[PDB]
């Protein structure tokens, strides 16, 4: 028996969303990662209802979404992760109602493991060099720059992976035109799992760790 699949109705779960001027103009746009499918919605004020423009079956797992419009940019480049380390920075193109992978970079293997990045995506709105990190001591720093034609040139990954330190959440704070500070709720699970007694559960709580990925140092330093 040979079976063939058909999606008689796409998913209806808004597991993620990100707001931004994605079409380029001042028109707001909200992207919803509904799991396998990614959709874009425009909140039409003339009618009140939100119109979902595109429902692209992504064939992956969008662990996180974090849009970013560059310094002096009309549209915004959505950063997406999947089951594999293939990080996709794509920008919407209203020419024919279709997306476009502006840059598909390879980070790690497939499978959302603890050491394979692709879980959390922390953008720096007051700067560049977005962090793309996993749950267990895996975090790369993609430096974004503008070419002569304002191209979104992705730099080399400046890995600042910790040692047996779990990551709760990661967000990039807007610095005052200085090196972008990136805070994360990190917890050292290595120093606790190496004692016979049992008191390691206490006295070891989460901690805010902020790294500065200055271009001068060319690496994310705490």
């Amino acid at each position: 028996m040979f079976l063939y699949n058909l999606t008689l109705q796409r998913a209806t779960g808004i597991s993620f969303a990100i707001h931004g001027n994605f079409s380029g103009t001042k028109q707001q746009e909200i992207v919803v990662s509904r799991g396998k499918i990614l959709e874009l919605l425009r909140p039409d004020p003339n009618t009140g209802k939100v119109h979902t423009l595109l429902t692209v079956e992504v064939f992956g797992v969008i662990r996180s979404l974090m849009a970013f419009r560059l310094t002096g940019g009309t549209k915004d480049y959505i950063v997406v992760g999947s089951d594999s380390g293939r990080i996709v920075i794509l920008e919407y193109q209203p020419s024919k109602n279709m997306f476009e992978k502006i840059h598909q970079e390879t980070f790690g293997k497939s499978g959302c493991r603890r050491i394979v990045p692709g879980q959390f995506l922390a953008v720096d709105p007051k700067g560049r060099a977005v962090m793309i990190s996993a749950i267990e001591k895996q975090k790369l720093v993609y430096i974004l720059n503008r070419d002569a034609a304002a191209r979104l040139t992705i730099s080399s990954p400046l890995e600042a992976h910790k040692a047996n330190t779990l990551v709760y959440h990661v967000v990039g704070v807007d610095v005052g035109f200085e090196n972008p500070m990136f805070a994360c709720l990190e917890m050292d699970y290595e120093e606790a799992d190496n004692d016979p007694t049992g008191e390691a559960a206490a006295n070891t709580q989460q901690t805010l760790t902020f790294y500065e990925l200055d271009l001068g140092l060319n690496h994310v330093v705490r």
Binding site: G13, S15, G35, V61, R63, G111, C112, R113, R114, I115, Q119, A134, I135, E136, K137, Q138, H161, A163, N164, L166, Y168, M187, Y189, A192, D193, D195, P196, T197, G198, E199, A200, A201, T204
Partner: protein
């Protein structure tokens, strides 16, 4: 750091194997969607609640000698 983290070797203890088992089985819970929208229906909690519970359980689950 990332040499072979995720699995032991020839004389890996059973506890140290189950610890990695749970520590890499929750990442497929906090990241995957069907196995995260299914646990929030059984426990009857929000996504953030169950995710924070699973994250806090990654300290030393499976029964820690701490």
């Amino acid at each position: 750091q990332s040499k072979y983290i995720g699995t032991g070797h020839a004389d890996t203890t059973k506890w140290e194997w189950l610890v990695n088992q749970h520590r890499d089985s929750y990442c497929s819970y906090m990241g995957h969607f069907d196995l995260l929208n299914y646990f929030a229906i059984a426990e009857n909690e929000s996504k953030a609640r169950v995710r924070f519970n699973l994250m806090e359980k990654m300290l030393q689950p499976c029964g820690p000698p701490a």
